[PDB]
Symmetry: D2
Subunit: 400 residues, 4 copies
């Protein structure tokens, strides 16, 4: 029983309500529950801890299949898969055994509260006072809490800010979402990705136990500067995002295809008698498929490289991580423009009647248009040209 | 010497405050329709001798563009209204022209149409038209797609004589009161964009058309298309309005993008960037958006002068004049569609992830353009130009070319 | 042992005279003898018959390495590699044994005076009269004959055009180029691909012996309609052309990169200090590499699909061939659009002084601008579009 | 003078189109064509009538450039540059230089060339030294490198950099001197993939005297004029708009040639059941996109031409706003012309086909011509200038190219 077959089954059912749920917005609890019951939430967990133990390429095909049915869910399951690796990326051998196992057998959803909204991306303003026993008390509020609402395990981030020399000490921690003080709000709203629960989360004196703290204080920053296994964060995240777009593009293409075949009318002023026999429609579809062909092929090739580097572990070099990031940055560019182009252009061949909300054909674009702004594609493109021309690798961070 | 453009700039700014709410709510925008009535711009294209502004096509288009930038739906609704009355000059009589123009101007009337089904065979048009001995007609049927029928004062309707007669298959053009017995404009329009265009159905139940309300002979439009006479300006006029409605929306999207970048946008600090307004790639994008519009606008404006030149020739216009005009308009339609789609979508790249929030409503510009750009296939506008360039062919005159 | 390393050595040697040989035109005769002496000519002939027995991906990477250094040499070697397979495609076992060994132990060049891609069967110049012994005699002048001049074994097509019951039948033959009446002219000239020797070739009462005829009369046309193993010609030929274009694209890009780092000057009116630190040059380089990334990944996937359908033998179904042709039809389009974009856009970052003939930078564009017109990329695109939308497979022929 | 200059240009364009192929492949100087231009009287096209000129407006002069450019990219460039050279005398020179030189140009029908750009570390780094002399003039030493028209010209517009123990140190001097002046050696060393007959070679200056009254304006007059956005700062808008129209001419040339081949030589793709080349729906689409791209680019260009005229007729009354706005428009036109000309000159081959790659048609000359000159200055910073204006209201830094 492979997880791609299970992913396909869930997709079939979610296409019926895709239009309903997209317009409605809000949380998609019913669908999130169906994903729990499938058991795909422990897809990247090894079999030793009651997981599927799937490789990255296999896991990506599952993400692509979910994303085609619904970009929000594809993104929800996407960010979910990126969260758990943080334990084995920086956390201890004790935390790895405990946290992976309890995710697997409880079928826990995972969310995170990392990015905020103040001066700029690199200006995180939530406190974390170090208690005498070792723990930390989180004070403040986040704004882009990807999938935090309705989740079980929350991968939170914070900063130490006081007179003591610990300024910009980035703490990571995985706590249960039922902890006192935490409040993931129902204020998420965007043009697309409407059911991705990327809202705010207020922290009113939320405690973090010694075992819940992931790695040393400012551990991620050290791994980024040294280009160690922790710096694989961005390469992993950015490939899943890219594959979510390509998924949405495939769904948009598949949805248009069937419409053209059964609903679209030929333009009779031009002497056309069949919509599927229109030369320019035929050309439009060729153009879309070929843009996906190129992008998908780059994506799958990049997935195998991620797996190769993943298998090395701590033995990975800056050269390995750099090249991978440049390739993934290249796939991010291809995915974005191919998804934006297809999701918009698909309307040309559908026609005027296809702007009726009952089809919801603009949901593909709205989903891609929204999440493509997560990080600027211009600098993904810029980071590749820097490598091409000067061999310069991207500075490791949360996105690069 | 009152300024038609400045009046439009006053409405836009008033609507700018409520622009986002209207888009999300949808339905009909009766409050905005009344503001345009009270401004008097509804008589923009009416000759001064009848009480209108007496404005030319270029000035008229500038007022349309300005309104379209504030609101895509209202720009289209006003835009389409302006093309309705000219129909009277194209095929109607001198009597009817003096009469119906005066009533529109002096009474500040909105106009709508239940006119052409441009991709349906004439015998499959829903509006049937039975003749009478006095010369009039009785209309029966439900038109699936109208333009501004709801809330209009005067309605320009096409019916087809689908009964055994010499008239069998003829298209009848009529201008009747919207409150004529049997006329029921439905509020059943629904789309991702152009939500307040009131482009729903309109039912006709034994609607009588009087002899003096019938515009020209039976099938006068189709006869005019075949001969490239004054009636064949229908497609050029309409297609050009649409193009400028698209260009208006893109300026709106570009204006709104700009203002967000200056006040709200944050600098990508991972790339050592201090200010959002000084980002090399953001600045490039704005250059490209402006450059693409620069080219489309300049072509549009050239086409309006050409439209005016052909308009001024009256009935003595030639198949060459009309043919060349439609080629230019076809080109502008393509330039407008491509630029508007690019800019209304591309603007998001410089705004940022926070700009996707409903309270800004930045996707309305795209939804409006993406929707109405499907009115007729841009691929064939492009092909008609290429057929002219390569083979010297002029488009076959009709409702959309 | 390693044919790619041998090619790198040839490219190394040729890159000193690349500029001059493009300018001069004519035959690349010295470089054609470097190719023979290397042994690469029998690359796609099985070990057992004297060749390298190389598989399709490997042979493609040799084409790419050659095409990168010189576009004419990439084409000429690429097309030669498609000629010999013709024997085991439509010919018998005895001829496969006889001809392959001859080609191998002699290290023969092959040319072609084969198909006319835009001509109705009863309009082809080269006509074949049936002889009493079972052979044919050719008469006419074919105008596009790549590699005919200087080749050892010529692949010639002829049509029977008379009152015979075998009217309009395409005869495929393999004869020595020195055969009486075979006169490959020295009349090729073009903006690019100047040294591909694709001039006309005259046939005047040229005898083709019974055993030199490949298969039955009209054996290719039959193979096409049935989608037999003979119909692999198009996907093979097309995929090689696609990899030639990408090779040339990599050539231009590597040459641009060298100039940008060594010669290019910074635009100081904007305040730029180094040409490598120019944001838009960096962007330009990202977009070129990104376009290549997608096109290359897609190309590679198609070589593995080619190998799979090649290894199936006669058990290949119309479906396999159809799916492969659509994939390669996409690849052909990506290679065309990427190569023309990069080889022209590369001038943007190079600058005015780089237009001097001594760099010869325009040769990359001229080469791909020339051969991209071999068959129309518009109908490559439409065939992909027809498959996507209507499940229709391309019409089996010499180009599709 | 009294006739329509665009009609005269068309006559010259017709005559040159019969030898365009051979002169492109041969390269070198187009001496016979340059002489055709001299004899036509069009070199005094922008000179006022009071000094013996044609007194044409900027839109008309630009139409002449476009018409010449469609026939021959190199001749369009050459005439275009000549039309940008002359204005410099009134832009920064005195009343007497205006009357004297313009009259000489009209009466003698002088070709003009320039010697301004160099081959140093970057385009602002100039090493052609100018030593002052106690009569007010200067002495020039060094080598210029992109000297379009310098060879065979009668009047050479040269830019020097002052070397002196004074405040004049590092000041830029503009001068108009006879090309035959002792020391000045225009070289015959111009080679390029395109613009092959523009004679943009090197020019050596060996103890070249620049007499006091041949100096145009005070020391650093251009640099001052740029900073103040005064009438002298119209150089960039004028030159850049002319270049854009050279590219558009060439684009039209490419499309016209393509069209005629498509109609006469091209064959239909018979595997797709296409009957005639002109009926192919994708060929039709291609020509439509070519025409559409040029429709927009040409209209933009014409708009900018009228705006230049407007600004030009204000004289000294022009403001930094007027100048900066004008330059924004032209920078946009430069971009539209660049990418339209490139896209069409290359794209035209898809509808022409393989047999049209033969050198006897010389079909790649349009692209090679555009591809070459499009690199005069970077289109990325024309686009960026427009972005700075749109986003922040900022006007371009006045210089020789912006
Ligand atoms: C560089 C180049 C190489 C070519 N090589 C061959 C060849 O080896 N065999 C062949 O039959 N045709 C060859 N052709 C011919 C093309 O198939 C032909 O140009 C096209 O199908 C029809 O040409 P047209 O579009 O000019 O009518 C070649 C064409 C070019 C431009
Ligand atoms: C065809 C052509 C003609 C040119 N003509 C001139 C000229 O007449 N005067 C001049 O100062 N520069 C001329 N230039 C040069 C530009 O002003 C600029 O210095 C040059 O393109 C920058 O060189 P780079 O790109 O190698 O840095 C010309 C360039 C080209 C390609």
């Amino acid at each position: 029983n492979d997880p791609v077959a299970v992913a396909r089954g869930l997709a079939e059912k979610w296409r019926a309500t895709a239009v309903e749920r997209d317009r409605a917005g809000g949380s998609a609890t019913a669908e999130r529950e169906d994903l729990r019951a499938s058991g795909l939430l422990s897809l990247l967990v090894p079999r030793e801890y009651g997981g599927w133990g799937a490789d990255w390429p296999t896991a990506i095909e599952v993400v692509r299949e979910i994303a085609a049915a619904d970009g929000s869910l594809g993104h929800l399951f996407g960010y979910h898969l990126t969260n758990a690796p943080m334990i084995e990326l920086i956390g201890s051998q004790e935390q790895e055994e405990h946290l992976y196992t309890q995710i697997a057998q409880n079928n826990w959803w995972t969310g995170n509260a990392s990015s905020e909204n103040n001066s700029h991306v690199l200006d995180w303003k939530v406190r974390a006072t170090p208690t005498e026993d070792g723990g930390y008390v989180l004070n403040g509020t986040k704004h882009f809490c990807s999938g935090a609402k309705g989740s079980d395990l929350l991968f939170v981030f914070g900063v130490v800010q006081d007179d003591s020399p610990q300024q910009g000490a980035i703490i990571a921690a995985a706590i249960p979402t039922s902890r006192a003080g935490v409040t993931p709000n129902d204020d998420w709203a965007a043009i697309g990705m409407r059911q991705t629960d990327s809202g705010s989360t207020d922290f009113h004196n939320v405690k973090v136990e010694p075992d819940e703290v992931l790695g040393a204080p400012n551990a991620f920053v050290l791994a980024f500067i040294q280009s160690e296994r922790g710096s694989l964060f961005a390469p992993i995240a950015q490939l899943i995002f890219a594959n979510v777009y390509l998924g949405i593009a495939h769904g948009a293409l598949d949805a248009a295809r069937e419409y053209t075949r059964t609903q679209a009318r030929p333009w009779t002023p031009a002497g056309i008698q069949q919509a599927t026999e229109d030369p320019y429609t035929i050309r439009s579809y060729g153009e879309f498929t070929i843009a996906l062909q190129g992008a998908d092929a780059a994506a799958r090739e990049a997935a195998h490289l991620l797996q190769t580097v993943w298998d090395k572990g701590d033995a990975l070099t800056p050269e390995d991580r750099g090249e991978l990031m440049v390739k993934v940055s290249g796939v991010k560019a291809l995915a974005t423009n191919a998804a934006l182009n297809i999701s918009s252009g698909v309307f040309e061949v559908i026609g005027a009647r296809g702007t009726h909300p009952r089809y919801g054909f603009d949901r593909f674009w709205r989903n891609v248009r929204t999440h493509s702004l997560h990080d600027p594609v211009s600098y993904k493109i810029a980071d590749v040209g820097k490598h091409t021309l000067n061999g310069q690798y991207p500075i490791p961070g949360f996105t690069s």
